[PDB]
Amino acid sequence: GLSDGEWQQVLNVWGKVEADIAGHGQEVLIRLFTGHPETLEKFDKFKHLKTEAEMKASEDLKKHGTVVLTALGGILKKKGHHEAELKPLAQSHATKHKIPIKYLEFISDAIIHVLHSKHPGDFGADAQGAMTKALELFRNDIAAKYKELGFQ
């Protein structure tokens, strides 16, 4: 449950991401994969990436980063009214990709890390609070769908 002012902060922060969705998406995934190498194993199409240099050079990783952040941005712009947008992602990530909710926590924190890394001094405490709450809401609603599906 975010206030109007918190959603305003979220969407203000998101404008930073939308200016360079592929660069943000790439860095989010690289942060996820390098911080939590087990997550790489969930991607048949990225498990060949042995080094961060290879990850950085991967155009397909940037492409997927764009897909991920485009989806997330579409969800965030719903300001919590995202059941229709979230449902297929929860279902695909539980049933097809088999992504534990822990990895969604990892990527949520990776987003925060990337925002500070790319916008140092420009991702204020209020913005971090609002973005964190929005990612918690996202993760929590996914978690509810995971529970429905019995997925761990």
Q: Indicate the residue type of 81.
A: H
Q: Are 14 and 76 in contact (CB under 8 A)?
A: yes
Assigned token pair, 42: 């969930």
In angstroms, what is the minimal distance from the CB of 90 to ligand HEM? 9
Annotated ligand binding at 93? The verdict is yes
Q: Are 28 and 107 in contact (CB under 8 A)?
A: yes
Contact between 42 and ligand HEM per CB under 6 A: yes
Contact between 112 and ligand HEM per CB under 6 A: no
50 or 121: whose CB is closer to ligand HEM?
50
5 or 144: whose CB is closer to ligand HEM?
144
* Alpha-carbon span 27 to 3, nearest angstrom: 29
Q: Calculate the CA 147 to chain-centre distance.
A: 20
From the annotation, which residues make up the binding site for O2?
64
From the annotation, which residues make up the binding site?
64, 93
**Binding region for ligand HEM (CB under 6 A):** 39, 42-45, 67-68, 71-72, 89, 92-93, 97, 99, 103-104, 107
